[PDB]
C-alpha cells in the first residue's frame, strides 16, 4: 500500500450485467414457392408461383454458354450474388457460417486460429521490483 | 445449434399452418435463455482466471 | 389487383430509402467528425431478421 | 342482392384473408398513449 500516482482515466469494460431482451422477431429466409390471389374481383384464383434462381436456374459455364430465353435466369440476383461472393471470399470461415441460417457457430467472437493470446488463460508473469537483480518484460513470448 | 435448427425447420411450414403457436414462443425463450447462460459462463471464466 | 401489387412495391421502395439515409450518413462519417460519442452495449446487441 | 357485393365492398371487407408476404405484426397506438 502506498501513494499511487496514476495518469490515465480510460475505463476497463466490466461490471454491467444487463438482462437483454429485444432480439425478438421471426427471422427471414429465402423461400421458393409463394401464393397469391391475382385480381381483386369476382374473378379470383389461388395461384402458386416459384422464384427464379431458387431451384430453376443453374450456374454459368462454357458448355451452357449463351442463354435459353425460356429459362428463368434472374439477372439481378445473379449479378448481386456474384459481387457478394467476390466480397464474401475474403472473410474466414467462422465469419462465413455466422452468415448462415442455422447457428453452428462458436459463441465466442474471437477465433482460435487468429487470436495470438490464449482465451481465458490464467498465466501472467509479473516481476516484482526488487533492488538488485534484473527486471524484464514479455516472459510469455 | 439444436434450437436454431428447430426454428428454421418449423418456420419452413406451409400456408394454412404458419401459426405463431406456443411452440414458437418456447423456442424463442430457449434461444434467449441459452445466450444469456453462455455469456454468464464467459464472465465467470474471466473472473476465475483473475 | 394491379393497384394493390403496385402499393406493395411502393412501400418496399420507401423502406429502401429509409435504409439509404442511414447508410449514407453513416458511411460519410470520419474520425472525430461531429457528434461522435462513447456508446456501450451495441457491440453486445445483435438483432437480425 | 347482386349489387350488395361488389369489388368495392369485398375490397373493404375484413373476414376475407387478402394476405401479404410479411410476417411481422405491427402495433397500433392510442392518442393519449
Amino acid at each position: 500500500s502506498g501513494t499511487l500516482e496514476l495518469y490515465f482515466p480510460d475505463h476497463l469494460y466490466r461490471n454491467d450485467y444487463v438482462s437483454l431482451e429485444g432480439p425478438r422477431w421471426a427471422p427471414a429466409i429465402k423461400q421458393a414457392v409463394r401464393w397469391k390471389f391475382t385480381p381483386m374481383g369476382r374473378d379470383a384464383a389461388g395461384q402458386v408461383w416459384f422464384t427464379g434462381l431458387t431451384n430453376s436456374e443453374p450456374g454459368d459455364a462454357w458448355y451452357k454458354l449463351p442463354r435459353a430465353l425460356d429459362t428463368p435466369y434472374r439477372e439481378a440476383h445473379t449479378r448481386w450474388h456474384g459481387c457478394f461472393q467476390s466480397r464474401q471470399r475474403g472473410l474466414p470461415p467462422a465469419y462465413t457460417q455466422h452468415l448462415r441460417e442455422m447457428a453452428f457457430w462458436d459463441p465466442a467472437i474471437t477465433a482460435q486460429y487468429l487470436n495470438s493470446g490464449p482465451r481465458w488463460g490464467c498465466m501472467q508473469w509479473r516481476d516484482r521490483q526488487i533492488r538488485g537483480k534484473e527486471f524484464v518484460v514479455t516472459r510469455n513470448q | 445449434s439444436i434450437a436454431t435448427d428447430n426454428l428454421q425447420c418449423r418456420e419452413r411450414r406451409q400456408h394454412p399452418d404458419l401459426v405463431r403457436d406456443y411452440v414458437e414462443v418456447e423456442l424463442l425463450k430457449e434461444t434467449e435463455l441459452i445466450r444469456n447462460i453462455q455469456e454468464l459462463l464467459k464472465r465467470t471464466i474471466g473472473q476465475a482466471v483473475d | 389487383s394491379d393497384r394493390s401489387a403496385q402499393h406493395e412495391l411502393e412501400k418496399d421502395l420507401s423502406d429502401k430509402q429509409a435504409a439509404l439515409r442511414i447508410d449514407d450518413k453513416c458511411q460519410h462519417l470520419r474520425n472525430t467528425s461531429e457528434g461522435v460519442s462513447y456508446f456501450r452495449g451495441v457491440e453486445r446487441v445483435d438483432a437480425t431478421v | 342482392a347482386p349489387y350488395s357485393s361488389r369489388s368495392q365492398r369485398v375490397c373493404e371487407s375484413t373476414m376475407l384473408p387478402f394476405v401479404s408476404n410479411r410476417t411481422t405484426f405491427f402495433t397500433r397506438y392510442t392518442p393519449d398513449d
Partner: peptide, 28 residues
C-alpha cells in the same frame, strides 16, 4: 362494419395482428 369490428378485435398494446385494411394480409 365487420372489418372495423375485426380490426378492433385484433388491436392491442402487445398483440400481433395479421389483418390489413385495403390490402393483402400476412402469410403467417
Amino acid at each position: 362494419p365487420r372489418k372495423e369490428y375485426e380490426v378492433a378485435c385484433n388491436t392491442g398494446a402487445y398483440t400481433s395482428s395479421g389483418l390489413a385494411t385495403a390490402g393483402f394480409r400476412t402469410a403467417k
